[PDB]
Design a protein around this motif. Structure first.
Motif, PDB file in Angstrom:
ATOM      1  N   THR A 181       7.801   5.830 -17.372  1.00 46.75           N
ATOM      2  CA  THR A 181       8.544   4.949 -16.489  1.00 46.75           C
ATOM      3  C   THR A 181       8.116   5.137 -15.045  1.00 46.75           C
ATOM      4  N   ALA A 182       7.912   6.384 -14.630  1.00 50.33           N
ATOM      5  CA  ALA A 182       7.461   6.628 -13.271  1.00 50.33           C
ATOM      6  C   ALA A 182       6.025   6.183 -13.056  1.00 50.33           C
ATOM      7  N   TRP A 183       5.222   6.164 -14.114  1.00 53.27           N
ATOM      8  CA  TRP A 183       3.816   5.804 -14.046  1.00 53.27           C
ATOM      9  C   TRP A 183       3.581   4.307 -14.096  1.00 53.27           C
ATOM     10  N   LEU A 184       4.471   3.561 -14.743  1.00 54.40           N
ATOM     11  CA  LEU A 184       4.274   2.123 -14.846  1.00 54.40           C
ATOM     12  C   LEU A 184       4.467   1.433 -13.512  1.00 54.40           C
ATOM     13  N   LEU A 185       5.327   1.983 -12.657  1.00 53.97           N
ATOM     14  CA  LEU A 185       5.720   1.287 -11.436  1.00 53.97           C
ATOM     15  C   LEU A 185       4.534   0.900 -10.570  1.00 53.97           C
ATOM     16  N   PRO A 186       3.585   1.785 -10.255  1.00 54.55           N
ATOM     17  CA  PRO A 186       2.386   1.334  -9.533  1.00 54.55           C
ATOM     18  C   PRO A 186       1.624   0.240 -10.245  1.00 54.55           C
ATOM     19  N   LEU A 187       1.620   0.256 -11.574  1.00 51.49           N
ATOM     20  CA  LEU A 187       0.859  -0.729 -12.326  1.00 51.49           C
ATOM     21  C   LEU A 187       1.535  -2.087 -12.271  1.00 51.49           C
ATOM     22  N   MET A 188       2.850  -2.112 -12.494  1.00 47.81           N
ATOM     23  CA  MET A 188       3.636  -3.321 -12.280  1.00 47.81           C
ATOM     24  C   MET A 188       3.433  -3.859 -10.877  1.00 47.81           C
ATOM     25  N   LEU A 189       3.358  -2.953  -9.913  1.00 45.34           N
ATOM     26  CA  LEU A 189       3.375  -3.325  -8.511  1.00 45.34           C
ATOM     27  C   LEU A 189       2.043  -3.918  -8.091  1.00 45.34           C
TER      28      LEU A 189
ATOM     29  N   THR B 157       0.818  -1.204   0.000  1.00 42.37           N
ATOM     30  CA  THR B 157       0.000   0.000   0.000  1.00 42.37           C
ATOM     31  C   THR B 157       0.855   1.259   0.000  1.00 42.37           C
ATOM     32  N   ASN B 158       1.791   1.354   0.947  1.00 42.36           N
ATOM     33  CA  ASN B 158       2.602   2.556   1.079  1.00 42.36           C
ATOM     34  C   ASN B 158       3.429   2.790  -0.171  1.00 42.36           C
ATOM     35  N   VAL B 159       4.101   1.746  -0.648  1.00 45.65           N
ATOM     36  CA  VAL B 159       4.976   1.905  -1.799  1.00 45.65           C
ATOM     37  C   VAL B 159       4.164   2.210  -3.049  1.00 45.65           C
ATOM     38  N   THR B 160       2.970   1.634  -3.176  1.00 39.12           N
ATOM     39  CA  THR B 160       2.128   1.929  -4.330  1.00 39.12           C
ATOM     40  C   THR B 160       1.677   3.383  -4.328  1.00 39.12           C
ATOM     41  N   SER B 161       1.170   3.860  -3.190  1.00 45.08           N
ATOM     42  CA  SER B 161       0.703   5.237  -3.108  1.00 45.08           C
ATOM     43  C   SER B 161       1.840   6.219  -3.348  1.00 45.08           C
TER      44      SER B 161
END
Ligand SMILES: CCCCCCCCCCCCCCCCCC(=O)OC[C@H](COP(=O)([O-])OCC(O)COP(=O)([O-])OC[C@@H](COC(=O)CCCCCCCCCCCCCCCCC)OC(=O)CCCCCCCCCCCCCCCCC)OC(=O)CCCCCCCCCCCCCCCCC
Ligand SMILES: CCCCCCCCCCCCCCCCCC(=O)OC[C@H](COP(=O)([O-])OCC(O)COP(=O)([O-])OC[C@@H](COC(=O)CCCCCCCCCCCCCCCCC)OC(=O)CCCCCCCCCCCCCCCCC)OC(=O)CCCCCCCCCCCCCCCCC
Lengths: 459, 57
Positions: A69-77, A25-29
């Protein structure tokens, strides 16, 4: 930029020092917030580009890749959250750390001023990808896949180091602003044609060319998902960016050292889309489609016209989003059937009538739907190629036909038909994996509403 | 009146003179080549630090 890649580093202690129950949760937000603060560098009210230091810069070609690249990370996660849910917490956190390392290194690549910075980071990206593919892949071919994906790259990239070293010993700086304003015309000798090849046949491997693409299906098919997202979304574009940066110091050799590669890209695009027409594996179908798309970007960058670089940027971003979306959509069924074979499950849209809309929109993105940044790119590079030679539309049209065909065939033989009544394990849906497709598609609509940003150096 | 020298009188230096001059430059030595000059300066910080590849400081 420093304000973007220091928080990205702080995301790692955020993983390791948080509870096991309050770490995704924290890392995604906070990753979503990194994506938000990665919009300050779209404040370009001027023609002059944004230099923050000797290290970091940001042009209109850098910025979309940075933001994506910064936007994909939550999606990957979030996509990585159903599998490795029964994995130990340290293993989870290692996955998270690898994804964040990818984020950081890729931002540093797209923001770099020198070519050596870009080199060491373009190669550092291999280690997270290899770890993700190998420790978290489900099958046994992941090892050969990692070997292929690593050694194609290294074979291509060692000559790149040699050529950059030569350019440093010849000019002195290897910085991109100065190589722009100080570029001597080349004497047109074999010693410089080898230099062209050494500078190009690292990126051309990674994009990829059709002569050399066997790493990309073997990796996409076998990486868990998030590796596939990245490998389809920005690792291929990490070659196009490099070509667009390095081609400026190779004039006039690109007028004649480009025929083989334009030609290979075009014919092999047709070959790859024909393969996509007839392919048992869905995750391979997406991959061969990615080859058939990136080939146009190869030809476009080879032509070096404004329309062409423009359409290349558009196609880059659009293909990245829609390909990540399609890989998510296939993973959504793979998390239930545990099979990549497409004709296995072929009668959905009964159970998943909403995901079947995300499927449709993902495909219409893939084929040339006009009000879309896919068709804008494909059309503008088609126009560039027609200016180049009128006899290329004969190939682009065959591609357009086959690309409608395999996409609609995918949709039909996966969704439409009679439900496979022997599948009691088709659970209804996840709010998580619906939000995934929404977050992949809403950007496409927004960027279509305003493509002034998504163009590149030339517009 | 010739007296015999005692034990260790013929084993020591004895300080002669002569009308001769000194030999100027025995060994027929040629002129020595001049050494390379030393760089005179109070040394300063390196201009822009290390000119390495992309390190700033
Ligand atoms: C001038 C040029 C302008 C461009 C014109 C474009 C021309 C090209 C036409 C493309 C045709 C595509 C097509 O065939 O439509 C398929 C598609 C099929 O959907 P469906 O199968 O009927 O959905 C039912 C579900 O299966 C069953 O589930 P359900 O009943 O719960 O679904 C209800 C409904 C629920 O949808 C929603 O709830 C919308 C979510 C957003 C909420 C908005 C919040 C508002 C606050 C904002 C602040 O549908 C959805 O769930 C789909 C959500 C995704 C909508 C995507 C919007 C695309 C707009 C493109 C522009 O049709 C649509 O519903 C999409 C919307 C219509 C397309 C836009 C029309 C043009 C509008 C001008 C802009
Ligand atoms: C932490 C809390 C402890 C207290 C910290 C003290 C806070 C403070 O006030 O002083 C901080 C101190 C001085 O701040 P300042 O005097 O006010 O401003 C001076 C400028 O920052 C001047 O800084 P600069 O930009 O000139 O950096 C000097 C040095 C940079 O020297 C460094 O510190 C390197 C930083 C890591 C990058 O060399 C460079 O110029 C940048 C070259 C970076 C080379 C990177 C090449 C390898 C690629 C990365 C590989 C991945 C890592 C290794 C493998 C990992 C896997 C095993 O600066 C920092 O420590 C911040 C570090 C910035 C990281 C750069 C990210 C790139």
């Amino acid at each position: 930029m420093l304000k973007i890649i220091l928080p990205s580093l702080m995301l790692l202690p955020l993983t390791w020092l948080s509870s096991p129950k309050k770490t995704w949760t924290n890392v995604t937000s906070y990753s979503f917030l990194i994506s938000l603060t990665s919009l300050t560098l779209l404040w370009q009210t001027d023609e002059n580009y944004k230099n923050f230091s000797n290290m970091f810069s940001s042009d209109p070609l850098s910025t979309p890749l940075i933001i994506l690249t910064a936007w994909l990370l939550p999606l990957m996660l979030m996509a990585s959250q159903n599998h490795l849910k029964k994995d130990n917490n340290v293993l989870q956190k290692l996955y998270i750390s690898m994804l964040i390392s990818l984020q950081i290194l890729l931002i540093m690549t797209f923001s770099a001023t020198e070519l050596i910075m870009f080199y060491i980071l373009f190669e550092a990206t291999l280690i997270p990808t290899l770890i993700i593919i190998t420790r978290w892949g489900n099958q046994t071919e992941r090892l050969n896949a990692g070997i292929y994906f690593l050694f194609y790259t290294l074979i291509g990239s060692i000559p790149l180091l040699i050529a950059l070293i030569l350019i440093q010993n010849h000019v002195g700086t290897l910085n991109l602003m100065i190589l722009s304003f100080t570029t001597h015309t080349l004497d047109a000798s074999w010693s410089n044609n080898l230099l062209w090849l050494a500078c190009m046949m690292a990126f051309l491997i990674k994009m990829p060319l059709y002569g050399v693409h066997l790493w990309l299906p073997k990796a996409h098919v076998e990486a868990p998902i998030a590796g596939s997202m990245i490998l389809a979304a920005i690792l291929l574009k990490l070659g196009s960016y490099g070509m667009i940066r390095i081609s400026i110091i190779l004039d006039p050799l690109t007028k004649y050292m480009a025929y083989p590669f334009i030609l290979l890209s075009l014919w092999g695009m047709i070959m790859t889309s024909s393969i996509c027409l007839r392919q048992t594996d869905l995750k391979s179908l997406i991959a061969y489609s990615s080859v058939s798309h990136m080939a146009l970007v190869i030809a476009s960058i080879m032509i070096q016209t404004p329309w062409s670089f423009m359409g290349a940027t558009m196609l880059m971003i659009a293909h990245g989003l829609t390909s990540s979306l399609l890989f998510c959509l296939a993973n959504s069924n793979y998390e239930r059937i545990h099979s990549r074979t497409m004709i296995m499950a072929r009668g959905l849209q009964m159970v998943f009538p909403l995901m079947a809309t995300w499927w449709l929109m993902a495909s219409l993105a893939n084929l040339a739907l006009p009000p879309s940044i896919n068709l804008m790119g494909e059309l503008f590079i088609t126009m560039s190629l027609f200016s180049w030679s009128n006899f290329t539309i004969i190939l682009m049209g065959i591609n357009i036909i086959i690309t409608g065909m395999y996409s609609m065939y995918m949709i039909i033989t996966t969704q439409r038909g009679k439900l496979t009544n022997h599948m009691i394990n088709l659970q209804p849906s996840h709010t998580r994996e619906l939000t995934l497709m929404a977050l992949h598609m809403i950007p496409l609509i927004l960027l279509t509403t305003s493509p002034k940003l998504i163009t590149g150096l030339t517009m | 009146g010739w007296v015999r020298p005692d034990l260790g009188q013929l084993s020591k230096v004895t300080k002669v003179k002569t009308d001769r001059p000194l030999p100027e430059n025995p060994y027929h030595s040629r002129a020595r080549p001049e050494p390379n000059p030393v760089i005179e300066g109070d040394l300063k910080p390196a201009k822009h630090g290390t000119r390495f590849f992309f390190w700033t400081v």
